Design a binder for these strands. Structure first.
Lengths: 172, 106, 61, 48, 197, 127
RNA sequence: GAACUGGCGAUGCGGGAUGAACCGAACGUAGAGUUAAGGUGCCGGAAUACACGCUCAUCAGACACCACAAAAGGUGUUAGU
RNA sequence: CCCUGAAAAUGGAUGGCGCUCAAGCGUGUUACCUAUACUCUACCGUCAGGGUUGAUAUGAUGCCCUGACGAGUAGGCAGGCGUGGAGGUCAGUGACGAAGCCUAGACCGUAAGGUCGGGUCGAACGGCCUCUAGUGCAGAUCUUGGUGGUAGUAGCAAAUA
RNA sequence: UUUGCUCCACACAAUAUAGAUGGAUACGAAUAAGGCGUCCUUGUGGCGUCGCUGAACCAUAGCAGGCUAGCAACGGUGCACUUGGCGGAAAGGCCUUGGGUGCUUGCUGGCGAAUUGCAAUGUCAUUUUGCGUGGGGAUAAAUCAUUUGUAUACGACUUAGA
């Protein structure tokens, strides 16, 4: 489900005769589609308040597009996840051009490094790092140096045919 | 001219099949120079001839023909499905067939 | 496959003809088959069905 | 179950099969390694 | 597309080359593989030698001459890999296997024919740099192949003769290229360049 | 000629031979249905012989037709043969196996006179 | 040895190499199309697809039922508090 | 994730070959392959609902229209196939060849089976409507008879020649 | 042994094809490096250029390819002849000297084709042979039987015999 979009989901408890106009709670949810986004909304509202989908209503769901989707950003993400033997809190840094793409990278990386499935991940917070010297992971820091430039040694060229006649090279 | 060919070379690969059951009514053909279904779309409906030789002369000739035609593409790599008037004899798995340019839409 | 809610190929369970080989009874059945098809009187249908019944289903009157 | 008493095998399994030789003249399978500095000489002889 | 495709086995990974050759032969293409002793297997030499020893122990208990046979030559190791990728027990599999020849070195007449490569099976393109790999000739020698030295000597002889061929070929192609360039910028050259030639 | 008919479709041209009639001489080819508890034929395992089924029934507009398009009527004599006088494009006469040669000559002459096709005109011909 | 349900027995078919029971789906005779479960290096029909990472094992690992593995350890390497 | 912990007896099993920026592990996005499943069509059968008689059809358990269904042991029922004999009929077949038998020859039926040609043969035998039963075989360590492989095999070597 | 055997030529008949339909078109080595060209105070040298696929290169026009005269030039390409070499891993192929001869679409010239009827592989290849024709060449053995015992159940083995 990593064709990720971000939605704002606003919902509430159902109005009653004694309590009209409830407090209109809102969440930011990364999900593949609106159905999953509303599911995640009710999942988190059930887990933090005494409101289930039966006693409430979704007032609004809107897709939030990245404000500047074409500038490279440094993102700090806070997650809590479940391992095989406990729950843990984690902080990670992702360099990428949008929030949804950072979160996609986050899910792929948590699956790769911790075998943490989507079920097992709560994204606590995704925030742009305003400036350098606040980045704390070296794998992001090393890309922020001055006049960065590196080669890509050992280029492997795709061959459309079964046999080549030339014993190819890896120069680049 | 040293060449007189007016057909495209093809190879009869196998029958349509699952892992353990084949269907001889459909033949899988690899057309030389075709690598994508998009390219193989050109050849749908083209007549196919399998040409083979016999000792006995039948009707003024010792070389016999099995006719068929390309029906649809198969997979992602340019293989096409073909149906023949009589099914190909399965000893021809790996034999050469001729895909003609008629009927022509170009 | 279909999740059948009732028995398939179930015969209606009613006689569609007299079991007897009486040619005269069969001629009566032919008459009232025509009458019950070509008239809208329920009487003809009742008589046609009564002509199918067995001996125990036609007690003497 | 195990033999209950160990003994060496009877006979040598490297001289198999115990068949008749294909010829009455046994083949010479290996000749001495050649020393090219020495004079030319036979490496074997035949006799009765 | 050629009637016979001659594959230089040097630098290829044995299993990927086997899969490619098996599909070629099953689709009715004739393949000659040369320099089987220069094939490559991923993983360290000791690892692949342990694998071959584990192969070596498998034999019919009551008669070893009918058990699995353990061919030591590099060409026969590659042939063994090709079996298992061809259903060799059928008539069609026997025909596909009869479409195949594998050699150590490059014997005649293939020594004067062009050799091709299979880039999807080339180690230099496929293995991550820094990963250990095994050379089939040395593995075969370690598991009992007898003819590594004679093949290396005779391949050196073929390589010197081929180098003389190539020096002559360089002279001729330089002559042809210079004379073609001289005849360039003529009317026919202009028109052919306009047409894309 | 006969009446025009749709193309004849047989739907199963292969004889339904009884299981193991090729195994044992004592088992004849006449179809019998396997009733054994473990029978692979009765259980319809893949790769076994097919069993006769009502689905194989011939199209009712071409059932009983010969490939010429005629139904076969067996005749023993000339009087039997005239029963097809007005039905020559739907019925063909077949002479019964036990008709003598000199009676077959008379039957054939009458059939040729009336236009009735005979399926076996060459039986018991003298030369 | 009991409970509820679904199955096998009484049932073939596609998949799990193989298998009564698992997954999918239940069956007249055919044609065409689309799929299920399962797959797409080769055997073997179908991408030696695309993408982000992790792992090098001188007993690697490789799919549910299912054909096992533990307590306990490692400046191996990778993320993290 | 990898390694140590981690030992069983014939040689051996991610199904096999093999695979190491995988053809392994986690995750995502597509394309593609193919079941007796789904959709559409034809045909078979079954069940259901219907139409069809004032000179119009083999004269109706016929013809026809419409829809939907089809797995199956033990078992139930129905429609049929075949055999010996009986009543009736075809003024049936037949020494110009009945019955039987043989036939990788033909035709009809989903099938039980039916029909035909050819060969052999020599005296009786069928179709249809009904009646009747000592009425259908692959098995029962079935009964009787006949015949194999084993097999030109074991054996025909005590008692002096 | 119905005047045998073998090898080149040749027309005939069969034959049966795991599958021809322009060309299998030759460095080696490395890949965190190389190819090619050029220059020098010959190197693990300088300089330039290329790759990012064979999507190339060669070939490729003519009744399945018929009939012909020249022009610059002595090219291109078959067929037999021939000169010398090289190649043993399975060489059985590669290169080269000279003349003869055919074609040449490099260019400009001259005639024909139809009716296979609107398609039907529309037959052009490659094997293995047997019967003839006309040239060349060569002129044996093995087994049984007998015999030995370095052998041996029988076969087999090992010896001998004009």
């Amino acid at each position: 489900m990593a064709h990720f979009k971000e939605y704002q989901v606003i919902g509430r408890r159902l109005p009653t005769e004694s309590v009209p106009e409830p407090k209109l709670f809102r969440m930011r949810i990364f999900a593949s589609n609106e159905v999953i986004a509303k599911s995640r909304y009710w999942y988190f509202l059930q887990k933090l308040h005494k409101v289930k989908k039966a006693s409430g209503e979704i007032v609004s769901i809107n897709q939030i597009n990245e404000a500047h989707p074409t500038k490279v950003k440094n993102f700090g993400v806070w997650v809590r996840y479940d391992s095989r033997s406990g729950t843990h809190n984690m902080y990670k840094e992702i360099r990428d051009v949008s929030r949804v793409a950072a979160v996609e990278t986050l899910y792929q990386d948590m699956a790769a490094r911790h075998r943490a499935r989507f079920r097992s991940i709560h994204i606590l917070k995704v925030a742009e790092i305003e400036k350098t010297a606040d980045v704390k992971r070296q794998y992001v820091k090393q890309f922020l140096t001055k006049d960065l430039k590196f080669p890509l040694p050992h280029r492997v060229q795709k061959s459309t045919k079964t046999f080549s006649y030339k014993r190819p090279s890896t120069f680049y | 001219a040293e060449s007189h060919r007016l057909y495209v070379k093809g190879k009869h690969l196998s029958y349509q099949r699952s892992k353990r059951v084949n269907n001889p009514n459909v033949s899988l053909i690899k057309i030389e120079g075709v690598a994508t279904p998009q390219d193989a779309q050109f050849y749908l409906g083209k007549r196919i001839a399998y040409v083979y030789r016999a000792s006995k002369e039948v009707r003024g000739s010792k070389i016999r023909v099995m006719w068929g035609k390309v029906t649809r593409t198969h997979g992602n790599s340019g293989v096409v499905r073909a149906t023949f008037r009589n099914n190909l004899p399965a000893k021809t798995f790996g034999a050469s067939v001729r895909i003609f340019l008629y009927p022509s839409n170009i | 496959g279909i999740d059948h809610t009732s028995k398939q190929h179930k015969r209606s369970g009613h006689r569609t003809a007299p079991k007897s080989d009486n040619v005269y009874l069969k001629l009566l059945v032919k008459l009232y088959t025509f009458l019950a098809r070509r008239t809208d009187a329920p009487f003809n249908k009742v008589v046609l069905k009564a002509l199918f019944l067995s001996k125990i289903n036609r007690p003497p009157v | 179950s195990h033999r209950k008493y160990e003994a060496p095998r009877h006979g040598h399994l490297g001289f198999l099969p115990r068949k008749r030789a294909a010829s009455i003249r046994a083949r010479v399978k290996a000749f001495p390694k050649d020393d090219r500095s020495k004079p030319v000489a036979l490496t074997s002889f035949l006799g009765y | 597309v050629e009637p016979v495709v001659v594959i230089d086995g040097k630098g290829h990974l044995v299993g990927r080359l086997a899969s490619v050759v098996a599909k070629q032969l099953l689709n009715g293409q004739k393949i000659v593989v040369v320099r089987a002793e220069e094939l490559n297997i991923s993983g360290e030499f000791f690892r692949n030698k342990l694998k071959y020893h584990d192969f070596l122990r498998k034999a019919t208990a009551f008669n070893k001459t009918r058990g699995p046979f353990h061919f030591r030559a590099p060409s026969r190791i590659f042939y063994k890999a090709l079996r298992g990728m061809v259903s060799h027990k059928t008539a069609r599999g026997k025909a596909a296997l009869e479409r195949l020849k594998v050699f150590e070195g490059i014997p005649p007449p293939y020594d004067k024919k062009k050799r091709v490569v299979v880039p999807q099976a080339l180690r230099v393109l496929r293995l991550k740099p820094g990963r250990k790999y095994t050379t089939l000739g040395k593995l075969s020698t370690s598991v009992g192949w007898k003819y590594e030295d004679v093949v290396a000597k005779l391949e050196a002889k073929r390589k010197v003769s081929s180098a003389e061929y190539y020096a002559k070929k360089r002279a001729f192609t330089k002559k042809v290229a210079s004379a073609n360039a001289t005849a360039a910028e003529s009317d026919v050259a202009k028109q052919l360049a306009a047409l894309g030639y | 000629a006969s009446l025009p008919h749709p193309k004849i479709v047989k739907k199963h041209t292969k004889k339904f031979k009884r299981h193991h009639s090729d195994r044992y001489h004592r088992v004849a080819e006449n179809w019998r249905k396997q009733k054994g508890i473990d029978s692979v034929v009765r259980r319809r395992f893949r790769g076994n012989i097919s069993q006769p089924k009502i689905g194989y029934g011939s199209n009712k507009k071409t059932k009983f037709l010969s490939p010429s398009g005629h139904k076969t009527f067996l005749v023993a004599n000339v009087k039997d043969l005239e029963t097809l006088t007005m039905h020559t494009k739907t019925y063909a006469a077949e002479i019964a196996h036990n008709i003598s040669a000199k009676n077959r000559v008379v039957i054939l002459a009458r059939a040729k006179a009336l236009g009735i096709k005979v399926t076996n005109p060459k039986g018991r011909l003298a030369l």
